[PDB]
Design a protein around this ligand. Structure first.
Ligand SMILES: [Mg+2]
Ligand SMILES: [Mg+2]
Ligand SMILES: [Mg+2]
Ligand SMILES: [Mg+2]
Ligand code: NA
Lengths: 220, 119, 124, 142
RNA sequence: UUAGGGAUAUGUGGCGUCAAAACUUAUGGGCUCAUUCUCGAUACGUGAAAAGGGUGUUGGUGCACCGGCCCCGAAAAUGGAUGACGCUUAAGCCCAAUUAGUGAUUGCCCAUUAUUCCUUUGGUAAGGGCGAGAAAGUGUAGCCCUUCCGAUGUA
RNA sequence: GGCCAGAACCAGCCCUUGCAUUAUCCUGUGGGAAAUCCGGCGGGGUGCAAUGGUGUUGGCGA
RNA sequence: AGAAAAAUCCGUAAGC
RNA sequence: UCGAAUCGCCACCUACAAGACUGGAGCUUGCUCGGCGCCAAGUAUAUUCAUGAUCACAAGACA
């Protein structure tokens, strides 16, 4: 929430609304560790990144193996005062953020700035839905990283079985969002077809040598 | 999907002979094949890995059989060959040609806008 | 009756890079050489093209000090500043560069920030 | 032939008079001009827009701040442009300078018009060069 | 193996992030799935024996044995350690390359080491001289100029 | 201001096919259609060489 | 400078 | 106060799923038949650019 001084400065200056350059990554069907390493290096290089759909990351192996690994992690606590001990976060976005934090140099101001440059969500929230197209990391995708015969696990199911009470909430919100987007995209089909037809028809009216150059370069 | 078989036409993906078309003349093993093409000067008989080929939809069944099949003409006619030639054209281009392409695209966009408004 | 936005402002004329750090090993860094990563340059053959070019690193200070054309063109006076350098050689297989700044080192406060790489100083 | 002779030169072969160059620095960065001559004693180049195409007058430019492209225009003009026209004593333009610019621009426009592809070359001289997000000048040829 | 500093190239060790280097290289071949200390994974050095089984192979022949990897055999006291995260079309293990059957040569990263350049200091030192400048000289603000070699260190 | 910058030139330094061997080879003319393979006869791709200077153009400085 | 916000009225990313 | 660093934008991207998967058929089961944007609102007939004097933060902006 902005302060009244910040609002007054903005009003007095009169400049228009500003948004910095932010990359939004759709993390569905990505390998957790490879995605974390790539994102950590980009954060250190100076990018602002927002990751969505953190509950559909992938890990290799069976859910039972990965759940046993998490329980072993959860067993560690400072015996003398557990309120100081390690804090075990159960949500998939917190799991991703902790993996990245362990891949960063966290006890330095530079590493702290890098870690604060990252935002993580489950699903796609309304303040992110309409900001532009999402990206993928092609060198960290499951269909090219795992052999197809081997089993794998989805982060949401494992996190649900170790804690994380909000799986059903996220599922309902995602279903509603996809329904709304599907309705909107079913609309505008006529407009898209009209623009495609206009593009096809303009060739008959533009100059012939321009058409020839387009055909030569393959934009025909 | 297109199968790997004797006489099948393939395109090379990477390497010094990339974006070239040849014919499979012998299956050495699960990973390697022998490729030749009399038409191309650089495509004499050699060994290629199967990670470096893309099968096409033509299979002759050597120079006489290839000429009779006329798969080279069909490949020249399809849209992939057009894309490859356009990529080579874009690669070898000058500032003047880039300017000409820019004005052609701007002309097409303007006329598309006019047609859309008219309709 | 259909309009589009057309970009007809001043042109850019440089490439956008980012400082990455200094040369170093497992024992520490040597601050007299800096590593720069430039956009769309991703091979050693690409990074060879940029050897000899000139790099800038613009920033700002707190007070208005002297600039190049202080007396003529008093419209240039500002808190903005710059620190020039030059590219010396590639740094690996993936298109990094080693740059050398004029007479001193680039400050470490610039480590994650933007660097301008110009096309001129060795035109061709 | 002699090293200190006034006719000595070293300038590369792409900056031949009549070529079209992209200005990389200065007030007219991004504009395209025509290379007219090289001043003696291995000196700067001389460019003209011509004005009314891009607004570049007769000016001096070092060859290190120009990309000489492969597109040229055949020019046969008188070229009475020494270094004294640019040297000066220790909106405002002298009569000699304005007259020289007028004559040279007239000859240049006549030559460009006479050349085939002349309309395309005039548009080419009117256009502006910029570096966009997503393109690699190190992979092109000019 | 060590005078005060640049540039170039290496040794041991490495090239997913921490952390410089394959922005996760290859247009190389095989093998392996590991459910609560436990799949592996930098020697020296800090994790194990008899016996028994799964997946890929090898002698023999008309079934027996005999090796690669993995599993069982394998049980302690604060919560914890291939360094951490993590990795399985490896970022694991055994071999092999350097941009790949296209045709001569070195993929790249990092030293108080090697080569080279500048400056100091000392010699079992080696030569020359006697418009501002020169003293027949162990040691100075060194009489002046050139040259080569060494330079760490407790009692 | 040799205070700060740019370009140019000298010197030095760093980088950037030939001839030998070509044969367990190449090429025509019983076995498993053809090919892979085995006996008869005839014709023929890897070891060396090829920092120091000497002015010029701006900025700041009345 | 980054919202698990929004995109005559009210009610419908519709007809409204 | 405040001058500052940042230099693509859009009611055509800003919906979705699968890689042993990709338009439709046939049986013969492997054969056959993003868009714009980069200097005339648009590819032509035009039109102001200096002296900001040969590099210097782009002396310019928030399409
Ligand atoms: Mg020792
Ligand atoms: Mg690194
Ligand atoms: Mg001593
Ligand atoms: Mg002592
Ligand atoms: Na280690």
């Amino acid at each position: 929430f902005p302060s009244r001084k910040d609002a007054f400065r903005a009003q007095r200056k009169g400049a228009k609304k500003h948004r910095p350059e932010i990359i939004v990554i759709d993390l569905k069907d990505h390998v957790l560790g490879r995605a974390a390493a790539v994102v950590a290096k980009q954060l250190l290089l100076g990018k602002k990144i927002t990751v969505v759909r953190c509950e559909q990351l992938n890990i290799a192996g069976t859910e039972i193996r990965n759940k046993i690994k998490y329980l072993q992690y959860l067993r560690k606590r400072k015996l003398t005062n557990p309120t100081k001990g390690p804090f075990h976060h159960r949500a998939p976005s917190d799991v991703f953020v902790r993996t990245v934090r362990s891949m960063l140099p966290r006890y330095t101001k530079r590493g702290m700035k890098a870690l604060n440059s990252l935002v993580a969500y489950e699903g796609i929230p309304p303040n992110v839905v309409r900001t532009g197209g999402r990206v993928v990391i092609p060198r960290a995708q499951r269909h090219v990283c795992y052999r197809s015969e081997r089993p794998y696990t989805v982060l949401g199911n494992m996190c649900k079985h170790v804690g994380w009470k909000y799986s059903d909430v996220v599922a309902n919100l995602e279903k509603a969002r996809v329904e709304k987007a599907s309705r909107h995209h079913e609309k505008q089909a006529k407009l898209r077809d009209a623009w495609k037809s206009a593009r096809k028809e303009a060739l008959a009216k533009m100059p012939k040598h321009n058409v020839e150059v387009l055909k030569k370069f393959g934009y025909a | 999907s297109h199968y790997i078989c004797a006489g099948r036409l393939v395109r090379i993906l990477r390497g010094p002979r990339q974006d070239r078309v040849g014919v499979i003349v012998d299956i050495v093993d699960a990973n390697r094949v022998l490729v030749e093409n009399p038409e191309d000067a650089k495509m004499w008989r050699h060994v290629q890995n199967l990670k470096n080929v893309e099968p096409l939809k033509y299979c002759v069944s050597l120079k006489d059989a290839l000429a009779s099949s006329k798969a080279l003409e069909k490949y020249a006619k399809t849209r992939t060959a057009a894309r490859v030639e356009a990529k080579k054209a874009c690669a070898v281009s000058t500032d003047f040609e880039r300017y000409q392409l820019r004005v052609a695209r701007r002309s097409r966009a303007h006329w598309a806008r006019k047609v859309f408004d008219e309709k | 009756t259909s309009r589009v936005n057309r970009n007809r402002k001043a042109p850019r004329l440089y490439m956008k890079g980012t400082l990455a750090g200094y040369t170093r090993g497992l024992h520490g860094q040597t601050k007299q050489t800096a590593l720069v990563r430039v956009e769309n340059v991703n091979t050693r053959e690409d990074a060879t093209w940029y050897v000899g070019k000139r790099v800038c690193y613009v920033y700002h200070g707190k007070k208005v000090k002297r600039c190049v054309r202080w007396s003529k063109a008093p419209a240039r006076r500002s808190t903005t500043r710059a620190l020039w350098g030059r590219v010396t050689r590639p740094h690996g297989n993936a298109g990094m560069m080693r740059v050398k700044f004029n007479g001193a080192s680039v400050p470490a406060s610039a480590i994650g920030r933007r660097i301008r790489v110009y096309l001129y100083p060795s035109q061709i | 032939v002699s090293r200190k002779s006034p006719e000595y030169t070293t300038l590369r072969k792409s900056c031949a008079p009549g070529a079209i160059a992209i200005i990389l620095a200065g007030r007219f960065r991004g504009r395209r001009a025509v290379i007219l001559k090289q001043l003696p004693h291995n000196g700067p180049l001389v460019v003209s827009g011509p004005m009314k195409y891009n607004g570049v007058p007769i000016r001096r430019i070092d060859s290190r701040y120009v990309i000489a492209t492969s597109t040229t225009v055949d020019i046969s003009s008188v070229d009475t442009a020494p270094i004294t026209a640019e040297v000066f004593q220790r909106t405002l333009v002298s009569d000699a300078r304005a007259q020289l610019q007028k004559k040279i621009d007239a000859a240049l426009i006549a030559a460009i018009k006479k050349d085939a592809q002349g309309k395309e070359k005039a548009g080419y001289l009117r256009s502006v060069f910029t570096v966009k997000p997503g393109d690699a000048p190190h992979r092109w040829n000019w």
